[PDB]
Design a protein around this ligand. Structure first.
Ligand SMILES: O=C(O)Cc1cc(O)ccc1O
Ligand SMILES: O=C(O)Cc1cc(O)ccc1O
Ligand SMILES: O=C(O)Cc1cc(O)ccc1O
Ligand SMILES: O=C1C=C[C@H](O)C(CC(=O)O)=C1
Ligand SMILES: [Fe+3]
Ligand SMILES: [Fe+3]
Ligand SMILES: [Fe+3]
Ligand SMILES: [Fe+3]
Lengths: 426, 426, 426, 426
């Protein structure tokens, strides 16, 4: 099977041929095997070492060997920004379109902080694919966080091949070349496109030096190169547009590499979930897998949080999520099973958006159940929900608002919430 | 019953006579009721507001009205530091001496970062008392963290009266005047004398904005003044020594006050305990109640950590603390019940010291029962252990090393750990 | 000739008349010589002293003495932003236009982070002028970094006169009034208009306390005032537009001044160039002259880097710049001679732009040459190339995309790059 | 021949048996092979992830299985602090003593910031040994930087085996157990014992993302374990003292480990030396290999700096080090050949100490030669010197001051400096 290197943020080193990596230097005059040294600077040169993301590649042909890029006619992301809407929104799962749509062609824009033409913050999509990619792609607009829901993915990147299935997540750095093979014929899932500071592990605070997503579970592929003599289309996403050129070699021609700006996968089943071992309901930030910070300490660009199988032990407490109003913007998804807060309507591939200060919380069915529950240890199982929480307002696209999937009467799930107040009895 | 004000770090305002607090200013020419304004600056003037600790007092006589202080012949903290000793140490509970001993006379130095003459870091004591104080006291050397184990205390402070029982903790700010009364004739407990940055709530990291010790549970007494017309001794602890003077008035004459440098109490039963809801054994920093930082970010002067009733749900996990070697210094106490990592020898009022890089962990019996047990939800109850963890090495006092309470064969609790290793069977 | 004060960041003091500057105060009731005190606040009042830029002026007439500003018909920066383009671009040198064109009228927008009406980050222009200014100008949108390529400039500012020639650079702070006279009748060069944090010297890190651009080399003009009666046009650049009013006096009427918000010039020939004394090719951030930071530590708004005469000693290394893909956006200019990585097509006055993740590096002919070359100490001389590197995307203007100077087949320079890969010979 | 893992600061994973590391957790109830989990916390739990140093160990027997430590009769560093001496000091190399002396018995205290009983900052020693260790050791006092000068070392640590030779450096974390075997029968070299923040790579500033000591050149050994039952002395250094206990098993019984608290080695010949490619003499901080910071930003507890083979190209410059007076304290050592600033008397194994504000610089011979030589590019070679620069004062021990190797006429190396001042000729 495919091999991997472990350790989030490590200075990795990988060669497909022995001695392909130069020893004791980055730029020899005549590189082993007659390879070309190339530097991929994922961060500004002057970043603190802790923030540094850079990889040295030793390849057959320089990435510079390409003709002029031309705008393609076929622009999945060229749709308008939907009109202003403060309502709580919920979508049913997205159907796979009948027309041939590969991985890059199938990104349906759901909600974003800014227009595709001026990338800032986070852009959220749902991908629907029915074709494997017969081209190579790189995103100039940001880091890609992939959340499969339906079907396995075999992702051929410049640094190696990774296999990603639902219940796992994968990250592609900005500008890195990749090609998506659909192993099950069709694929559906979620994407967080990070335009900001790279995703990293959260500051654990009192949790200390261990817990949540343990760095040892972040897997990076080993060196792997191709040698195809012939035309291969290279596509790039630039300011929301797809631009392409034809190469006469495969751009996945990296024989060896070393550095820290790498693609990676992580299995969510390995999450060391922390929670209440006493009473009350911890803030959902406790379930943080990865985070993208801003220059405002403590206020993330986005937080990727999961709602995984876990033990529920809170005594004399209302166990489902509390009623909530938040400065932050809450985009919810579902990979497997059902979510603890919504009795009906939220299915795998579905989505919910509770924007800035929009009043949310449990439905009446969940409320009645929880207040009547005989509280004893209970293990939540066979489920995996997640949230992409952003600091900037998420603006739904015109496409997601005109979407047949956008539920018509979502507000009705809270309509049957009764008054239980009696001032004459504490 | 005593009344209290809630909220860790609040700018409180309290008056025993209506209008005693000047409205709209701190320093009127003619203060209401003929009282005197006095500022107790708990920090440098230029500290960030988040770190600011100062209280304005409106009192019958200024603190400045006192004769010269005289050095007392009786000095409970006059013994020198013990000899260099890297061993793992355990003491049985300290008996209460027969000789008349009040709260300030009853501190037994256990271990400290420095000699009493040059206060730095933390100094740890165990107090034993059989008399209520017939004098008033203030500590110029540091903040006092009080952990009662036996007996109830009535602490009359300059800002008011607070009652503390075992399972509660109390903090007295540096230089604040107080008198301790024994409600049950005798009293025993632990003291963390903080010479550094004042104790405060830990930054929660992913736990978020709620959890661990909630700010609403930190209670400060309401204004209360005494009016006894007789000679009162005022004692101060300076550079480890007890110095005294005689007053003709009561120094607990604060009629009204406002500010943030306050005495407070906290009930440990209200701690919102956070832990594993999955597997593994979280780092004990997760149990932080209060912490004193240093200028080195993330490395505290001391952490006040508890081991309270909690749900144990970790699946296919060694539940007791893992075997450990730590940069930090671990001093443990026990208020009630029995502790997780130790089968015998550790009793309420007892103590343990595992210094820098000393090899500690669960004793042999504990280790054995944990590996063979059938795992299921289990509630640890009717117990409360704690730790004073210090970044600086804790040097036990000569009195603590020469103590008949120091256990002779502490090392034997690990003596029977067996090799269960078989390189042919995973 | 012209006299200058030295020392980057100094609290300077200059006076055209004896005692014109008030002693021991900034705002006397009766100023010396009957002058008016005026505060020029370059930063918010509350900035840390290290970041503060402010200058007190002692002038004949306050700056407030002006009528309403009117919008001019001539608007050289009103041109729209070009279409989205990810391609690598290279412009041949810009011709001086035939029409009367002064310094502020001759700015050709090349690439900018945002539209002119909403200034953000950095805006890049190539200036072409054939007339001296017969008016006084101030830019309200940001700080101007001037890089002369042809012709000397005599820049008369409110704080004095400074002369600048190719191989020197000049900075004029935002809001400061100035008038450009062309000493050689015509001029051309580059401009980096900084809309963010003022340019400053780089944090040296391991280079230490000396090196790169030494502070003693940053020269500020001495106080110089004018008293010419009649109509003077005062122009200001506000949200990309030129607005003007008519004054009856000369606005360069500052008799004395003191402070840190000053125009300055630096000779690039005095750069204490640091590099490799062993092997490899150091990141070009090592040649940083000046930098504008952002809120994100380590990620600059812009870095002004130079590629100056220098010793090349790296043994067993590929000496020209490595092949590169960067998060940053690289705008290159040329003052004299030729640049190391480009064999032909890049001339003095020319420009290149390699945007976010665009694949760049040495052209085919230099790559062939460097691999074969016998490595010996070699002094790169008779050259001065530089870079404006920006964190935000640089959008070329419509004009820069339709310019006859825009080289149609820049991509061909890398077309002949061969594969020298041999998988059977390391 | 030994296997290594590369990458300074990586989250490493190594197993001597397949599947010996638990998958997806740290604390299984039944660990693979019947091994014990044990955590080695190198830092406080709450440090920022960039500062975190911790290693999970999977061992045959917990480190806790040890009897009481007893104070050894032989005490290499119980000697008193030398008296006050501000003088510039120079020692000739240390001869190996005739009495059987293993690595830990042969530490000659040279200079330190504090008394051995109160470790703080850094302690410097020269090691001299004629015997391989027939015991296992750990230092509870500090991290150890080893700088071999004569003879090869084979260091068996808890995480595995590493071989160090002169021109290589090796670091051993605080509390980590190790045994030194002398490959040449006898060995001599320097030691910097860091009692403060762990050494790490310096912030590169303008050097950027690569250069100096590249992280790929930092090698950690692979997992290795010992089985041999029988008596073995375990020795610890605690507050300057050697304490011991007897174990009935080898303590180097780690079958598998993962983490970032690791011993490592680095080959100085791999240093990507940066220096002037123009003129002048860069500050020596430019040669930093590793640094231990303080809470004061920019002021290190210590900097380990090297003076390796390098190109000297500075034009019209005095090339040797400039005459200097420093707040910092300069301790120099020599591994191979001769050092540039001193013609004679500074031999390999020698040392110099120029304390706070002591006036140093090149000797008279080097001074004349450098003012007469016709400047051409020159390769310094066949040499390797270094410096331990500390912020706190370095007090020499009584042994180093009473030492026959202390040169009584060091001040005479400067005695012959002439006055070349000629007011009549610039
Ligand atoms: O269920 C939701 O909509 C999200 C959510 C989860 C949680 O654990 C607490 C609050 C919250 O709003
Ligand atoms: O039992 C102890 O001494 C303290 C301790 C507690 C814990 O939860 C984990 C490790 C540890 O050493
Ligand atoms: O030639 C370039 O485009 C600029 C450049 C300079 C350098 O030293 C390293 C890399 C690089 O891209
Ligand atoms: O390159 C250097 C510059 C100044 C210093 O004093 C040193 C140390 C000295 O040689 O003793 C080295
Ligand atoms: Fe919410
Ligand atoms: Fe511990
Ligand atoms: Fe580049
Ligand atoms: Fe020096």
């Amino acid at each position: 099977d495919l091999h991997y290197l472990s350790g989030f943020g490590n200075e990795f080193a990988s060669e497909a041929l022995p001695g392909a990596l130069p020893v004791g230097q980055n730029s020899p005059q005549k590189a082993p095997y007659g390879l070309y040294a190339e530097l991929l600077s994922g961060t500004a040169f002057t970043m603190a070492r802790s923030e540094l993301r850079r990889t040295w590649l030793y390849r057959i042909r320089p990435s510079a060997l390409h003709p002029r890029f031309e705008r393609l006619a076929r622009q999945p992301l060229g749709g308008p920004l939907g009109g202003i809407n403060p309502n709580r929104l919920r979508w049913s799962p997205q159907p796979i379109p009948a027309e041939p749509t590969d991985f890059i062609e199938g990104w349906l824009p759901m909600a974003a902080n800014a227009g595709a033409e001026k990338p800032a913050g986070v852009s959220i999509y749902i991908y629907r694919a029915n074709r494997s990619m017969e081209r190579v792609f790189f995103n100039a607009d940001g880091e890609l966080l992939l959340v499969p829901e339906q079907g396995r993915l075999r992702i051929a990147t410049e640094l190696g091949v990774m296999e990603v299935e639902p219940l796992e997540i994968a990250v592609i750095p900005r500008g890195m070349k990749f090609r998506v093979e659909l192993l099950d014929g069709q694929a559906r899932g979620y994407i967080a496109e990070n335009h900001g500071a790279p995703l990293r592990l959260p500051d654990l605070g009192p949790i200390g030096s261990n817990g949540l997503a343990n760095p040892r579970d972040f897997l990076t592929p080993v060196a792997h190169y191709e040698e195809a003599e012939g035309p291969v289309q290279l596509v790039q996403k630039f300011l929301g547009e797809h631009w392409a050129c034809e190469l006469q070699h495969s751009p996945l021609d990296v024989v060896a590499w070393h550095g820290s700006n790498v693609p990676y996968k992580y299995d969510l089943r390995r999450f060391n979930t922390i929670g209440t071992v006493s009473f009350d309901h911890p803030d959902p930030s406790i379930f943080t897998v990865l985070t993208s910070p801003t220059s405002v300490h403590g206020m993330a660009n986005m937080d990727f949080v999961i709602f995984p199988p876990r033990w529920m032990v809170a005594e004399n407490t209302f166990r489902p999520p509390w009623f909530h109003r938040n400065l932050m913007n809450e985009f919810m998804g579902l990979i497997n099973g059902a979510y603890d807060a919504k009795a009906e309507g939220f299915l795998p591939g579905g989505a919910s958006l509770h924007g800035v200060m929009s009043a949310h919380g449990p439905d009446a069915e969940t409320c009645e159940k929880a207040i009547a529950a005989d509280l004893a240890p209970h293990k939540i199982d066979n489920t995996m929900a997640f949230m992409f929480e952003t600091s900037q307002v998420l603006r739904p696209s015109l496409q997601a608002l005109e979407c047949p999937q956008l539920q018509a009467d979502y507000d009705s799930c809270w309509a049957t919430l009764p008054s239980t107040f009696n001032p004459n009895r504490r």
